[PDB]
Design a protein around this ligand. Sequence first.
Ligand SMILES: [Cu+2]
Ligand SMILES: [Cu+2]
Lengths: 347, 347, 10, 9
Amino acid sequence: APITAPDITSICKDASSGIGNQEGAIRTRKCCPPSLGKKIKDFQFPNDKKVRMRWPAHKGTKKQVDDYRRAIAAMRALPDDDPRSFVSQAKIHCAYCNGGYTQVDSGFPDIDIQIHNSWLFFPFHRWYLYFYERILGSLIDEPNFALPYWKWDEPKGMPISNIFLGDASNPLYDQYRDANHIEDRIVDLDYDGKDKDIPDQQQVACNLSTVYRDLVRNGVDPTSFFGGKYVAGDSPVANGDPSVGSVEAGSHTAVHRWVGDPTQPNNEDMGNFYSAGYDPVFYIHHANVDRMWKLWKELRLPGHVDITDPDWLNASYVFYDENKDLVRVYNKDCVNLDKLKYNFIEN
Amino acid sequence: APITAPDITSICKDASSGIGNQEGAIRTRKCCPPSLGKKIKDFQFPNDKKVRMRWPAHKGTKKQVDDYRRAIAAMRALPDDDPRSFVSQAKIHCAYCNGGYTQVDSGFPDIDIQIHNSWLFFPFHRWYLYFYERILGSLIDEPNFALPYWKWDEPKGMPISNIFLGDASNPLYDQYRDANHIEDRIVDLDYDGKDKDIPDQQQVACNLSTVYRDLVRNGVDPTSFFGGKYVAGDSPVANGDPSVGSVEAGSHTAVHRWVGDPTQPNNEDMGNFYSAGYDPVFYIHHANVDRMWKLWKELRLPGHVDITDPDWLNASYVFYDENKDLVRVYNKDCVNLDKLKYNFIEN
Amino acid sequence: VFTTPCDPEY
Amino acid sequence: GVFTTPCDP
Ligand SMILES: [Cu+2]
Ligand SMILES: [Cu+2]
C-alpha cells in the first residue's frame, strides 16, 4: 500500500524527529498547517496558456530578479498563519521531514511519515515547488511567474548568486548561512564536512565530476537514482542510509551541509530539514535538484526510466495552493513537466 | 570462430596496411619475425614466487629506474635478428597491426589479422607486454623485474617522465617525438590534432574528465569498453569506426597522436602502429592502458564484466618469450592478473 | 548536457 | 581509488 498523507489540518503534531538540539533550536517546531474549514480535493492539471520557464539564478533579467525579490517580500509580509506565508511554506518542509504526520490513513497511526531518504524524495519536492512557485506568482499578480534555479552544474552558476547576498534589507537574504562558505561563494557539491582548500578552477571541475557521479556513475537505475522502496507500514529511513538515491545523498546533501551555518545549534537554516525553508535559497537549490530528474531521463541510457510501481505511483501528499484550497497530489501526476506547465531555460 | 594467429615463422608478409606514406617510412615494413627452428608450444602459467609490481614512471626508486634503463640498453645491444632485440620487439606491433599475418588457420588465407579496433585490443596488448616485461628482466637477471607505467590518470603522473628525456645517451630516449609537446610535458588525453592552449591545471582537469569518460560514461558494458566483436572471416575494422572501445578510441589514441612527431611522414614513432614500438614510452603508456582494464573491473558497476563469448576466449596469438621459445597464448588466460604474476602499485 | 574542462568554452 | 577525480586532494 502507498504512503498517503492524512488530513494534515486534523492529524498533525509538533515536529520532534531528526533535530539533535531541540531545546536550543532557533526556529519553531510548531510546523502544522493552518485550519481554514477547507475540504481536501484532488489535483486537476493546470490550464496555463504558457509554460513557466525557470531561469538560471546567475543569468536573470532585471524583471525576473525584481519579480522574484518582490514576491518573496510579499510572502514575508503575510501573517504567519496564512498558509501562503514565508513561515508557513518553510513549515511544510518541517512537517513532512521531521515527524509532523503519521500513516494513520493506511492503518499505521503509530508510524510517522518521512518523505526523505526514499523514492518519495523527487516527487514530493517537485510538488512542494509546484505550489510554492504558483503561490509566489499569485502574490504579485504575475500569471507566468517562474522560479530561478541554482545551476551549479554549470561553472558560472556555481558561485551562490549575488541576488541572495548583502544584508537583511534584501528579502532574499538569510543571516543563518556559513559565513566562511558565503565568502568562498563557490559551492562544493562534494562537501563532506571538511573544506577542500583547492583552487577555484579545481572546485569547478570537482562539481562537474560530482554531477556525473550522481547522474551516471551512481544513478544507474531507478532504485539507485530515486532511492529505495518505501511503503505503508515502513519505518522512517535514517539520514545517510545507503539506500538513499544518488542525488539526494550526494550533491543535494552537500549543498545543504555547505550552506548551513555551523555556529547555529542544528546548523540552521539549510543545515537541517526543519529550518531549511527559512532560507530563500532552499527552494532555488531545490529547483535545480528537480531539474536533475529531467536531465537524468534525457541522458537516454540503460536504466534511466521512471518508476512504474503502483505503491509509488499512488503515493500522495496534501498542500495548500494559491487560493488557500487543500489539494491532494499523487506521484504519478508529476512525472511529465509539460502537463505541470513549467520547465527550465536550457543552453 | 575465433581469430587464430598462424605459425608466424612460416606465414608472414611485409606490412602494407595502415601506412599512409610507405616510401618515406622511417622505420622498416619488413616486420616478420625470425625463424629459429622452434616448435610452437602452449602457454604454461608462471611459477614466480613474487608478483611483479609495475611502478608509476614518475615515482620509481633508484633501482627501479636503473634496472629499466639497463634492461632497455641490453635490449638495444642484442643482435638485430634476436627475437628479443629492440627492433624485433617493435616489429611485433607492426606485424600484428599493419597486415603481417592472415587468417589461414581459420580457413581464410586471404584475409588479414588485425588486433586493433575490436575486442582483441586489450588482451593482445596484455600478452605483448607480458612477454616484453619478462624478456627485459631476463636480460639483466632480475627475476622480479616490473615495467614502469605512465600514470596519466594521476595529476603528478601526467607529465611525461624525465626518465625518457635528455638525448641519445639515454636508452629511454627517442628523437622521433613531437618536440613542442615534449616541451609542454603534460599529455592531453583529449588530444584531437590541435593544441588546446589552456592552463596546465585545466589540462589536468580535462585529463581526469577523459578517464571518467572512458571508464564510466562511455565504457558501460563489454561491447562499449572492450570494442566490437571480431571473428574469423571478418575484415579489418577501420580506425575511427564507432564500434571501437572507449579506451582504445579515447585516451589511448590521444596519447599516441600527442607523442608522435608530426614532422615525420607517418608521424613516427608513436603516431603510427607500425613505428610506435621504437619509442620506449610506447610500452610504458600501454602498461597504463593495461591497468585501465583492471580499474574498469574494480569499479564494480553494472556491465563491468569480462567477455565470456567463446569466440573471444579462444582467440590466440604467437610470441617469442625470454627463452626464444614460440608460445601460443589465448585471450581466456590473461583475464586474471594474479595468475600472470604481476600487478600495479596503487596509492 | 554538461561542459567539461576540455571544452573551449569552459 | 579507483581513479583520481578533481575532488581528491
Ligand atoms: Cu526536503
Ligand atoms: Cu597496438
